[model samples]
Target chain A: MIIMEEAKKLIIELFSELAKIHGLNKSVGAVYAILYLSDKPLTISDIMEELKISKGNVSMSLKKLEELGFVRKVWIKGERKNYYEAVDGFSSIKDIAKRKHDLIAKTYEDLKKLEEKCNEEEKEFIKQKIKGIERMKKISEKILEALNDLD
Target chain B: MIIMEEAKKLIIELFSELAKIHGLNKSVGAVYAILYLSDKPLTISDIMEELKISKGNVSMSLKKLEELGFVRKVWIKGERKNYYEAVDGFSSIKDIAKRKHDLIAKTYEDLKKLEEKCNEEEKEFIKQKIKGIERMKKISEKILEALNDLD
Candidate 1:
């Protein structure tokens, strides 16, 4: 049981890094890690005790965690307390990459609209980036498809 | 030529969105977009005139831009002014993804260390998450490898 501390610490550390890079609060990462390691669905009190964090922190963390698909609410028999469980939405990561690819395509389309207005030199530059963008689109598609294959 | 204004605007908007999502300043995106559309390497004066921003802003944007592999400096004989060119560095995207995969592997190793200390029921739950994490690792590896194949 005591060794579980190190495990949770590492998980929380990694979880926090990803979320922080994503501009999310670190407490949310800690909450996700705690719920992720539990055997059964956990209540707010369990999280509060386990993390030694405040009720409000756990509540808001759950709010944001569920909002982002990191955790979900679970129902327990004859229980008034709210229960929560961890969820790992790996596909969401793919969806995000897909969205970026879509934006790259959009950016290219927008740039092309100006191609006719530019001189030969400028046109060549735009075409160069367009080609690069096309390659990136392929890269993103290949990656997204590859992720689907693994699942 | 006038349509170029609208084209640049859209480019900046999209670039800003991506950079902002990645937690970068909006100006850095604008600088990248400007350089990306230019026919040749541009001086700071060009960016300043194009964006109508301060010299300091242009200078600092280029600093951060090149630091993140979004742009790079160039040299031209008989030209005293510093010149900069845009770079997509899309493979850097794959590198970031690869690093995340490594972190996922590390997190799983840390979690498994606590598995032996738990009861059968707890062990099953840890194993379940570990399985999910294993899937994520495979997913990341596939996507990274796919990105490599595209190049």
Candidate 2:
């Protein structure tokens, strides 16, 4: 039983650090780990008690985790409380990559608008630089498509 | 003259926002933009005066920008103050992708360590889930190699 609990603790710590690397709140990772390790779905209070966190913290963290496709809400039959479970997917990361891929197009177009104003000597240089960033956009788009094709 | 200056302003604003997207200090982007648009390498005070930022703030941001390969330190002939200039590269983003790609392998290995303690009923499910994530590692590695071959 102790070893079983230790395994869960390590995953929680693992995810807590990993979440920060990608700029997510630490508790979001904690909540996901707790639900991931559960034999069944967990209620918000169950998570709060496990982590000793505020109910509000658990609520918002669960919400963000769900947004990232890391967790999902479930309703227990004949029970009033809502429960949640973890999903093994990276939909949110894909969503971010798609948005970031589109951002480069807008950034490229915006920078091109000022080419007329660039000093003549620097115009060709700047033009080529912005034009090259589009390749980054295309490569990222390809990666996104490849990911989409996967699952 | 008006729009030429506006050109610089837009790049500064552009980089400021873009830097935030990747979790960098906004001033790092601002400093890079100021250097990027310069006619020549700029002294620290030259950037400070242009952006109205403190000297210490300017110093650290320049250091970080240099660390990311977004900017470089340069010394002018017979000049006392050090100068810096922006580079046309995304070395920092590549560095981040490389780091993040490596991070997944470590995370996967760590989770695998606890498989022995996972409830016997859940063991196969967890193992399959983790084994599948290695695909993420290989695709990202392919992307990194593609980027490496590009330049």
Candidate 3:
């Protein structure tokens, strides 16, 4: 009753905040809010009707959510519409930490191309910068290791 | 030297991933990458030279970074060049969690507006959504409380 409404609000806020950091609009957040809060699965049309947003917006938002490994679509027997739900399988925090680490690793590889060519001062500055990023990486690496143990 | 480079690479990844989520371009990410890794202050020119990016790009990126509370400009005594440095105030993870709570609060306010006019089902949906948001809000509230203590 009152509790579910509270949950619904929390779900939207969660998705919306994630969207904000990622530079997405609020509608994307809305779709996630719906999926995460719903106990049973939901149809795309159900989402469109509930949120009162355009079908196209839902499609685009769902696509992005799927790419992020958050939302999944399923087809039910005798039902034509696609159902969507958040991926509840993996540790959400660990998945997030891993994705972050991968991005950092990629950045490091790219910077390596310039290492030898940098001047002494520039080299020194780059050296200091790299140290900070490694601190973050090590922290995530430890978390990832612990997550593996949990599974 | 090797360790610094590793750390810088990780920072680059963090900023880039954050950029994608924030929908910012890669060069903007380069600026953040620089900020994250640096042990000393940097000017717009310093960032430009380090990233090999244009002055305009550095200027724009620095503006955005300042807006995000990630970096700020400093005046060194007797120095005209405006130096920029990373905040280094606290955990990035805490900042992220705070951002989440802000989004929740905003969404809750929006939903409250629709509360008076909505029908039964719509009201129910919004209800559930709000509940989920409250749970997260509680988590974030605790985090903010803990963070305030750190300060």
Candidate 4:
């Protein structure tokens, strides 16, 4: 069992790291942090008031959170405020990673058609990029395997 | 060796998956696909002309690539065009993932603090979010370690 303060520390630290790597904002990070720590659920106002952040920031963050399936919005009986909670676990995380990997692969497929159109110089460059994509794909598959191993 | 076409197909599939998971656009996806397949270095213009994408898009995507350390900007002895190549190999990919995880962790840390100030009802939501952040951090660290396990 971890204390809320300790939980906060972990959430903030993780969110910042993710944002920097992924080019997301602090709000995105915070939203993730909040959902990651909460065992139960929270509402929009709850997040705003509890976090002492702006309503707009919380709102935007929550929206992104919901989109990612990182957080879910719910209704509490009799309570006017909506509830939100982090999704179960690693499967969701893995799904997120996997989808992005597919997007990279999809674009690579589209670009291949142009290879025939390129000059020698362009061809050379295309070859290099292709190699990089392959490596990334291999790693992504390996990671999925690794996650399975953990499960 | 895989045919360029076969390789590109495989590559693009992986990129698409990655983009969807990461919630990125197709342009960013395109950049990765190109870099992953390339056998040699490339320039921003090279990406644009080859991919038939916009200059601004290429520029922005390359900027992101450089930041991620997945692509490196370089120069060949006598060539006037700026060259870009993927980072050495698998280790770099893992590092990129680690960097992404770290950023996520950082953002979560900030959210934790905000979650603390909420009243009972709202607190639950923030707590759930905090849990999500913590899990993400733990999972990322584990993934990073697993990536290191590869020979």
Candidate 5:
């Protein structure tokens, strides 16, 4: 238990630190840390008990983690409760990059909408800004491709 | 001034929204937006007046934006006041990516130090996790390279 406890603490710290860099709150990483260290799929109650966190917090974290592909749902025989465990490895990191790429793509779309409201002078200046964002969009896409290729 | 006010509001909103997508706070983006839209480099007082934010807040934002390469200092002849403006393009985005890449690389080094504290069993598990972070570090570097090439 001491070994497991210490490992869990380290993993939690790792996730929390990385989460800050990525702009995610600490809880998301804490939840992932718990799931990753578990040898078997864990129920929501198990996580709540272990982490002493709220049910809603645990649920939300699981949903976001699941969406990001860091955590997966599993079914256990003789029980109706849903269980979850962290995915094997780095796929979710790429998924996060892909998600942010899609967001910048959306930003490009918003820029198009904003263009309609600008006067010619404003439009000209904004056009240059748009071009910069467009370049960033391309860079984001390329990074996503490279991440995919690495998988 | 009304038109400019509306424009400032819109730019602030844009920055806040995009900042969330990139994991940055709204203030950092807000500071960049103000500088980007200004016809000339702005003094700290100028930014404070336009944004109606505290001096300390603006100061910190400028410092962070400067560090990220999103904002640059300008020297005006015959003027003692420091002035700043947003950099012209996507280079700042790459700079941000570069900054984060350095952070994760440091995390890799920290993990090396952590290895010394772990038992063999714990060491093996952490090794796998360290490899995952190393992969992310490489991906961040590649993205930085592509961003530079695009420029």
Candidate 6:
């Protein structure tokens, strides 16, 4: 279907852009995008044929997506090939944001240790940074709460 | 202070990690961390001395941070040297999140255009994706709102 072709192209573009900004591989997003949109679980071959990408590329993408819990492998009756579908909803996105927030918190903890070692003048500067990190922590906590509300 | 050495090392580590996840260069976050922690505005010389990085690197990092409104240049009255400090609030962070939300909205618009070109079966799949994108949009909007509340 010519329409299908165009739609696939657009989905790939959206996924690629989202992945790049989220610091993920382009193929991971593309695979998730396609699978998320499909009503029926898609086989690896189906994904490969549609995207015109290599079996290896598709396999790796699917593997990563599955690992991230964004996609789940489905067993189809009478089919030897494995099928996959996206995990519906915004759970994965929220998990990612939560992970980033955790990273910031970890950084804050590490910075606090450094704060202990600084002279008075340098400590003042570190204190300012700590305050900024505190604000960031609060914002992230609020964001997570907001996301959970949507869920 | 030997402690200063350890502090610098840790700060750079945190900055580089944050920058990577946020889709920015290591230097950009590194510069912000240093500026954010400084008691008073720091001259380019001070930044260079602390980081031991090249003048060009420091200049470009400052320029980028300034453009993003994460840092500002200040004149120290009697001092002829240009000095800089990090922006002390989360306003720029909220703006960054808002910009990302706008991008997702733009992508949703582009996907809608593609949906028009799709055949019924293809449209079904595209529609599913549109639903997912809509969810993402809501999440992002909620994130921005949460950030705004913090401000």
Q: Residues B1-151, candidate 1, lDDT per residue (tens digit)?
A: 5655666687777777776545456788888888877779999999999889999988877887776666889999999988999875675566567767888888877677688677678787567667877776787787777766766
In order of listing, the candidates' clash counts read 0, 0, 37, 101, 0, 1
Answer with 3 or 4, whichever has the higher TM-score.
4
Candidate 3 at residue A110, lDDT? 53
Candidate 4: where is the Cα deviation over 4 Å?
Answer: A1-3, A52-56, A76-83, A97-142, A149-151, B1-10, B76-82, B97-142
Worst lDDT run of 10 residues, candidate 3 chain B, spans: B142-151
Best by DockQ: 1
TM-score of A-chain in each prediction?
Answer: 0.70, 0.69, 0.70, 0.75, 0.70, 0.73
DockQ-superior candidate, 4 or 6 = 6
Candidate 5 lDDT (Cα, 0 to 1): 0.74
lDDT of each: 0.75, 0.72, 0.67, 0.67, 0.74, 0.76
Q: Please give, for residues A1-151, the per-residue lDDT of candidate 1 as tens digits.
A: 6756666678778776666544456778778878877868899889999888999998988888776666789999999988998765676566666777788777777667678667577777556556766776777677777766765
* lDDT tens readout by residue for model 5, B42-92: 999999988789998899888867756678899999999999988865755
lDDT by residue for model 4 (B22-67), tens: 5455566678677766768888888887678888988877777677
How many residue-pair clashes does candidate 3 contain?
Answer: 37
- Model 5 over residues A1-151: C-alpha lDDT tens digits? 3543554576677676655555465777788878876778999999998788999989977887776678889998899999999996567666666666675687677776667676577767567656756776898788887777775
lDDT of 1: 0.75
Model 2 chain B worst lDDT run, 10 consecutive residues: B125-134
Q: Worst lDDT window (10 residues) for model 1 chain B? A: B16-25
lDDT tens digits, residues B43-130, model 6? Answer: 9889998778999989978987786678889998899899999885477667667766886788788777777766477677667667
Work out the TM-score per prediction: 0.65, 0.62, 0.57, 0.65, 0.59, 0.61
DockQ for all models, in order?
A: 0.38, 0.19, 0.19, 0.24, 0.21, 0.28
lDDT score for residue A60 of model 4: 77
Candidate topping lDDT: 6
Docking class of 1: acceptable
DockQ of 4: 0.24
Candidate 1, superposed: residue stretches over 4 Å from native: A20-88, A113-123, B2-6, B20-28, B31-88, B116-122
